[PDB]
Design a protein around this ligand. Structure first.
Ligand SMILES: [K+]
Ligand SMILES: [K+]
Ligand SMILES: [Mg+2]
Ligand SMILES: [Mg+2]
Ligand SMILES: [Mg+2]
Ligand SMILES: [Mg+2]
Ligand SMILES: [Mg+2]
Ligand SMILES: [Mg+2]
Ligand SMILES: [Mg+2]
Ligand SMILES: [Mg+2]
Ligand SMILES: [Mg+2]
Ligand SMILES: [Mg+2]
Ligand SMILES: [Mg+2]
Ligand SMILES: [Mg+2]
Ligand SMILES: [Mg+2]
Ligand SMILES: [Mg+2]
Ligand SMILES: [Mg+2]
Ligand SMILES: [Mg+2]
Ligand SMILES: [Mg+2]
Ligand SMILES: [Mg+2]
Ligand SMILES: [Mg+2]
Ligand SMILES: [Mg+2]
Ligand SMILES: [Mg+2]
Lengths: 47, 139, 124, 183, 88
RNA sequence: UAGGAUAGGGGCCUACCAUGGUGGUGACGGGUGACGGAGAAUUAGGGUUCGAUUCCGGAGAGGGAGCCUGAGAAACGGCUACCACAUCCAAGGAAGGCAGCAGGCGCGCAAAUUACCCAAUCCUGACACGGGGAGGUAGUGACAAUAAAUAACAAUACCGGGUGUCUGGUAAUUGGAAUGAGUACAAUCUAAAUCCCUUAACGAGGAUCCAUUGGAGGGCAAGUCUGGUGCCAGCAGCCGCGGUAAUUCCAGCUCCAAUAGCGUAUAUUUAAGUUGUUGCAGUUAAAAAGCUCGUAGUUGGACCUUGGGCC
C-alpha cells in the first residue's frame, strides 16, 4: 500500500524560520571561534 | 614453503598469476562479468518509470519502502530503484523520465530493503533533492 | 614630474634604427599616453620629426607609478615605412586602414574559381 | 595543438587523513587564532611546503658526506633558510633544518611581521591593512598577506606613499566628511 | 608518412636551441645544407634569440633580403640555413 | 639450386629437389570495453592501476579492391569499380564522402561559437609582398588548479582573570576613519576590440554589498532542548532507530566540520602483512596430495696466492 506516502511530513506543524543577525564570515569567524574556545574558556558546546 | 632459488623467478611469477584468482575483487574485475550488469559499467543510467511499488522491509524492521520499477533505455533491462526523502513517491508518475544511480555498496543491497541496489536521483530532469526542499517544481 | 629611462639600448644598423626598453616613472598620474611620450622622446633624443618614433607593448606595474614598454627610433621616415608592419603605421597616422572581411574574401575566391577567363571579374 | 596545454600546474595543500580528531582540531584552531589566518587551508599549505623541505633535507642527510650531490644542495638549502630568516646563524648544519616547524614559517609572513613591527594594532588589523593596499615591501606595494619576507627586506616594510597612513591624500570617507562640513 | 615533413614542433627542437616552451607551437625546421640539422644553428636563431638585431619572423627576412649575411664567405638568404660548426 | 620481379635483400613469386620449421622456457588457438612509447594516479620501501587526447612512431578517410601523376601516395578536401547509404532532375542523365574548423541529428550519465585575424610561432608558392578553421584572439566553461573579500579600531553598557587598578571577552549600542566588489571619464592593452594592470568622479552600518554544503547515538567533531508522528511515515554506507516521554524520522533553536566550496554514484590507489619477492598462511579456524617412483624445472659438501715488500 502506497497511499500513506508522505504522511508525517505532510501532517507535521509548520513553524516559520527565525530572523537573526548574520554571523561573521571568513577570518572573523575563526577569530570568534578561537576566542570562544581558548580566550574565554577559562562541559559541552551545546549543553 | 616458498621457492627461494635465484633461478626460480618464473615459478614465483606463475604461482602468483594463478593464485590471484582466489581474490574476490580481482576475480570480479578481471572476469568481465561487470559488463553484463544492467548499468554495463556506468555510474548512472536513465529510464522510464514502469510502475510504482512498495517492498516490506526485512526483519526485524517493519516498514514499506516506496520503490519504483523502471526500465533502462540503454539496454531495456527492468530494475527496481529506491525513492528516498519521504513524500518523493508523489513526484514520480507513470512512464516518467528518471535518472538512476547506484545505492552505495557497489552492486549489493543497501539497508533492510530486500534486493534493491539502485536509487532514483533525478525525475523529469529535476533532482529529487530540489523538489523535496521546494527549490524546484516538476515541469 | 615624469622621467624616462632607456635600457638595453642598441643601435640596429641593419634595420637602420635604435631599439630600447623604455621605462616611464610617472608618480601622481595613471599613465602616460604614447602621444604625450613621443614628444618627450623626440626632445631627449633630438629627432627632427615626430613620426620615426614608435612606442608599444606598454604595461603598468602592479601598485602603479611605473610603466615599461619597447621603443624604436628611425633615422628616416622612408626607412620607417619599409620595415614596420602596417598596423604600427596606422597607429601613427602614416597609412590607411582597409576595411575588409577575410570570410567575405574567401567567399568570393571560392565563387570565382569556377569561372574561366576574363568573365571572372564580370561576376560582380 | 594548443600551446597553452604545456604550462605546468600543481596543488599546494593535502588535507588530513583523519578529519575528526579533538587534539588536532584544537591545535590547528589555536594556530589559526593567533596567526590571523582564514581557514585550515592557509595552514595546510604551510605544512605541505614544510613537509617538502623536510623530505628533501632527510633525503640529503642519507647520503655520504663526501658526495657532491649532498654538498651542493645542502649548501643551497641552508642558503635558502638563512635567506628567509628561518635558520639562525648558529644553525648551519643539515640537522637543524630537520627540526623546523610550522610556526617558523608562519612567523615570516608579511602580516605577522607587520603586526610585530608595531604598525598594526592586532594581527587581524595587519591582514586588513595588507589587503587594503597600505603596505609596501622595499618600493613595491604588496596586498598579499602570505608574502614571505626575506631578511634583507625586513628593514623596508613601511606604509606606502599613496597610503593615507604613509603620506597620502584622505580617503573617500574623510573627503566625504570634509565635503559635508564645507557647506 | 607518405613523404617528407616540413614542420618542426617546438618541443621536438634540439636542446641547445634554448627556446621558450610557451613561445609557439612550431620551431624553425633547419633546411637541407652542409650540417646535420641537429648540430646546426639556423640563421633565424642568430639574428634572433642570440642577437637582438631582429625581433620577429618578419625582420630576419627583412635583413636577409638586403643580402646582409655572409656565412662562409658567401651571401646566404635562406633563413633556416644550417650554420653548424665553426662557420664564419 | 636457377631464374622472374623489385629501388634493392628475401619463398617475394615460378620450375625442380630435400623433409623439414615451432612447442610445458606455453608454440598453435581464444579474450581484450588492446594502438605502442615518453608518461599519469597513489606511493616508507617494494608495489598496484591507468595510459583515446596536444611530443615520437604506426594505421585509417563509410567497407574492401585497383591505379594515374609525381622525387615522394596504393593519396581519398585524386581517379576507377563493387557493396551500404544518400543528393538534385526537365526522369535522358549528373554529382557524392566533416575520424579538418564551426554547426545539426542520433546515441547516450557524459562534452562549448555555424565569431575575428594572419598581429605572434612557423609552413608553403615563381615569391621581402599571396595564403594558411595550421596557429593565434575573443565567446561558453565550478574538468582541474593558484592567490584571495564578506569587515578592523576606539568609546560606552555588561561579564571574567593577574578592596583596588590593569588585562581579556559580548551588545541590529555610539563614533569616526579604511577599502574593493560595482559604476565610469581617461590612458594603456589589442591586427581591431575586450579582460587584466593604472586611474578622475561616484560607491558600506542591520556596512541587506544578507555564505553555502553536510551533519549533531557510536565509528566521528557537535543536543539525553522544544513541538509533531507513533514498528506508520521515514532514517540508516555498518551497528542500528521509530510499537505515546524518539539524544537517530518531520521541523524550530542551538552547536559542529569544511568554507567559495561541499554532498552523492561508479572505476581504482592506499588502508591490505586480506596476494605477502621484501612479507601471509596449511594439528583444531579455509587450506599436506592415500603412498611411493619419476623426466623437465628449482637447489646442490669441502679443496687450488700467500708470504712481499714497495706502496
Ligand atoms: K628483392
Ligand atoms: K613533383
Ligand atoms: Mg600528417
Ligand atoms: Mg634470387
Ligand atoms: Mg613452387
Ligand atoms: Mg580497439
Ligand atoms: Mg597513446
Ligand atoms: Mg580530441
Ligand atoms: Mg600522432
Ligand atoms: Mg593512408
Ligand atoms: Mg563517418
Ligand atoms: Mg584510398
Ligand atoms: Mg573531408
Ligand atoms: Mg588527407
Ligand atoms: Mg562536462
Ligand atoms: Mg534534528
Ligand atoms: Mg562525539
Ligand atoms: Mg521528542
Ligand atoms: Mg591470511
Ligand atoms: Mg571443522
Ligand atoms: Mg580444517
Ligand atoms: Mg599424509
Ligand atoms: Mg660449494
Amino acid at each position: 500500500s502506497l497511499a500513506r506516502a508522505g504522511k508525517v511530513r505532510g501532517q507535521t506543524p509548520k513553524v516559520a524560520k527565525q530572523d537573526k543577525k548574520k554571523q561573521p564570515r571568513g577570518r572573523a569567524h575563526k577569530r570568534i571561534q578561537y576566542n570562544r574556545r581558548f580566550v574565554t574558556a577559562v562541559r559541552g558546546p551545546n549543553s | 614453503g616458498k621457492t627461494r632459488g635465484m633461478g626460480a623467478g618464473r615459478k614465483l611469477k606463475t604461482h602468483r598469476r594463478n593464485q590471484r584468482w582466489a581474490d574476490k575483487a580481482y576475480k570480479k574485475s578481471h572476469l568481465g562479468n561487470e559488463w553484463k550488469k544492467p548499468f554495463a559499467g556506468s555510474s548512472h543510467a536513465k529510464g522510464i518509470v514502469l510502475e510504482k511499488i512498495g517492498i516490506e522491509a526485512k526483519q526485524p524492521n517493519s516498514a514499506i519502502r516506496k520503490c519504483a520499477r523502471v526500465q533502462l533505455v540503454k539496454n531495456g533491462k527492468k530494475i527496481a530503484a529506491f525513492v528516498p526523502n519521504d513524500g518523493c513517491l508523489n513526484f514520480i508518475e507513470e512512464n516518467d523520465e528518471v535518472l538512476i544511480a547506484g545505492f552505495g555498496r557497489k552492486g549489493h543491497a543497501v539497508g533492510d530493503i530486500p534486493g534493491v541496489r539502485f536509487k532514483v536521483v533525478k525525475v523529469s530532469g529535476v533532482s529529487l533533492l530540489a523538489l523535496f526542499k521546494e527549490k524546484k517544481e516538476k515541469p | 614630474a615624469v622621467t624616462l629611462r632607456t635600457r638595453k639600448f642598441m643601435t640596429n644598423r641593419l634595420l637602420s634604427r635604435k631599439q630600447f626598453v623604455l621605462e616611464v616613472i610617472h608618480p601622481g598620474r595613471a599613465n602616460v599616453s604614447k602621444a604625450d611620450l613621443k614628444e618627450r622622446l623626440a626632445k631627449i633624443y633630438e629627432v627632427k620629426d615626430s613620426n620615426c618614433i614608435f612606442v608599444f607593448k606598454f604595461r603598468t606595474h602592479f601598485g602603479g607609478g611605473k610603466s615599461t614598454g619597447f621603443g624604436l627610433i628611425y633615422d628616416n621616415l622612408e626607412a620607417a615605412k619599409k620595415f614596420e608592419p602596417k598596423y604600427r603605421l596606422i597607429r601613427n597616422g602614416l597609412a590607411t586602414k582597409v576595411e575588409k572581411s577575410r570570410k567575405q574574401i574567401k567567399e568570393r575566391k571560392n565563387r570565382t574559381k569556377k569561372i574561366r577567363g576574363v568573365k571572372k571579374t564580370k561576376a560582380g | 595543438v594548443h600551446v597553452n596545454f604545456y604550462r605546468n600546474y600543481g596543488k599546494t595543500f593535502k588535507k588530513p587523513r583523519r578529519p575528526y580528531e579533538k587534539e588536532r582540531l584544537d591545535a590547528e584552531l589555536k594556530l589559526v587564532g593567533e596567526y590571523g589566518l582564514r581557514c585550515k587551508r592557509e595552514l595546510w599549505r604551510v605544512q605541505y611546503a614544510l613537509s617538502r623541505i623536510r623530505n628533501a633535507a632527510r633525503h640529503l642527510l642519507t647520503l655520504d658526506e663526501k658526495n657532491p650531490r649532498r654538498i651542493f644542495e645542502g649548501a643551497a638549502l641552508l642558503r635558502r633558510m638563512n635567506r628567509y630568516g628561518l635558520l639562525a646563524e648558529g644553525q648551519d648544519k643539515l640537522d637543524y633544518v630537520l627540526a623546523l616547524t610550522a610556526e617558523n614559517f608562519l612567523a615570516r609572513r608579511l602580516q605577522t611581521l607587520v603586526f610585530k613591527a608595531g604598525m598594526a594594532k592586532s594581527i587581524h588589523h595587519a591582514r586588513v591593512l595588507i589587503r587594503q593596499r597600505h603596505i609596501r615591501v622595499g618600493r613595491q606595494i604588496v596586498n598579499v598577506p602570505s608574502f614571505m619576507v626575506r631578511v634583507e627586506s625586513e628593514k623596508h616594510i613601511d606604509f606606502s606613499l599613496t597610503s593615507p597612513f604613509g603620506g597620502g591624500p584622505a580617503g573617500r570617507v574623510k573627503r566625504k566628511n570634509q565635503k559635508k562640513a564645507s557647506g | 608518412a607518405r613523404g617528407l615533413k616540413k614542420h618542426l614542433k617546438r618541443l621536438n627542437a634540439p636542446s641547445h636551441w634554448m627556446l621558450d616552451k610557451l613561445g609557439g607551437a612550431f620551431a624553425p625546421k633547419p633546411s637541407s645544407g652542409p650540417h646535420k640539422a641537429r648540430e646546426c644553428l639556423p640563421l633565424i636563431l642568430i639574428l634572433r634569440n642570440r642577437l637582438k638585431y631582429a625581433l620577429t619572423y618578419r625582420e630576419v627576412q627583412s635583413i636577409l633580403m638586403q643580402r646582409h649575411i655572409m656565412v662562409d664567405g658567401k651571401v646566404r638568404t635562406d633563413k633556416t640555413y644550417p650554420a653548424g660548426f665553426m662557420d664564419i
